[PDB]
Design a protein around this ligand. Structure first.
Ligand SMILES: CCCCCCCCCCCC
Ligand SMILES: O=P(O)(O)OC[C@@H](O)CO
Ligand SMILES: CCCCCCCCC
Ligand SMILES: CCCCCCCC
Lengths: 62, 63, 77, 78, 70, 71
């Protein structure tokens, strides 16, 4: 029950990110990444979850 | 999109139950058990992969 | 441009290991036969089996990395 | 529900056998343990330079060099 | 084989100029114990909107020395 | 603030790298049909002396990464 309560949480978070935001929204890879990254951190909040979402976004374009 | 990656990472950062469940040893064995239970069904959507990476990246900071 | 008894012997063994990986015909056939349907399920099935016995050593990580990188290239074309 | 996948099992069983030969090759681990614990960047370069001295840059060699690199980073870490 | 000599000699001087820049080494060493000063420098590096690749490598040079101290 | 001086030095270094026309000229003159062999021959020549300082690895990463864009 220990690992099961944690995996169902991440599984619940993962599917709700996949169904809420119409993702897979995707000319020049480097520019547009730094374009959204500058807009992600216009407010000086560099929280860790923002880097993780920005990490996957960078690997998507490659 | 810029606000999409923002609120996605923010709500994942603010889930008090998730941050409490992550705080609950031997990191690699639990990560393998968590990853095996996450994809016990047959869907490997990006959100689960990101949430597993977010769990792994948080799991390596404690070690 | 420089060697030693130990480093030269170490280099030839790593070179022999890497060459036997790429020339293992049966290994290359199994890798080339993976489905382009979902390489994620294949990668998960492989990783789950490689760490099912509760044992984790870096040779298996390295072998999983060799397959994952080849799986990425085949799924690109 | 993930059921069976016999062809993937043949592959994962082979990769698992390959990774265990690397970890249990006592001749390889002896050579890895017996390289200078002083300048790990230097010995890594000389190994890499000799591995690709012949014009062959196949991916299996890169992975074998990455394996030696990964073990090299751990020895200098402990 | 000689065309390599000029290029490798320039990259060699670039790397040595980086590590032997005493003012730069002092500034990198004067940081505090973590991941947030990296973003403070990063957002300060790209505030003019220029994301040319040389700046990313220069930031990688700082981050790698920053992560070694950790 | 305190990081302002360091941020301007890294930004200056990055701008000097990309604007070094003689360096960009040499990187652009690399054989596109064998970028791997050119890289190894440059890397072996860079460390032909006994020095393996981290700055040289970063410079090698700059040349290698620019090599991957053309490839
Ligand atoms: C004491 C020097 C730091 C230890 C680094 C060892 C890593 C060697 C492998 C290099 C791979 C790029
Ligand atoms: O020759 P292989 O082993 O396929 O690797 C080549 C790859 O590194 C780029 O083409
Ligand atoms: C112990 C199995 C870990 C496998 C990671 C799951 C990633 C699949 C996309
Ligand atoms: C050849 C890969 C060098 C990176 C070493 C990483 C060690 C874990």
């Amino acid at each position: 029950a220990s690992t099961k309560k944690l995996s169902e949480s991440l599984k619940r978070i993962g599917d709700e990110l996949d169904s809420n935001m119409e993702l897979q929204r995707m000319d020049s890879p480097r520019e547009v990444f730094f374009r959204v990254a500058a807009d992600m951190f216009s407010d000086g909040n560099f929280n860790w979850g923002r880097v993780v979402a920005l990490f996957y976004f960078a690997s998507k374009l490659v």
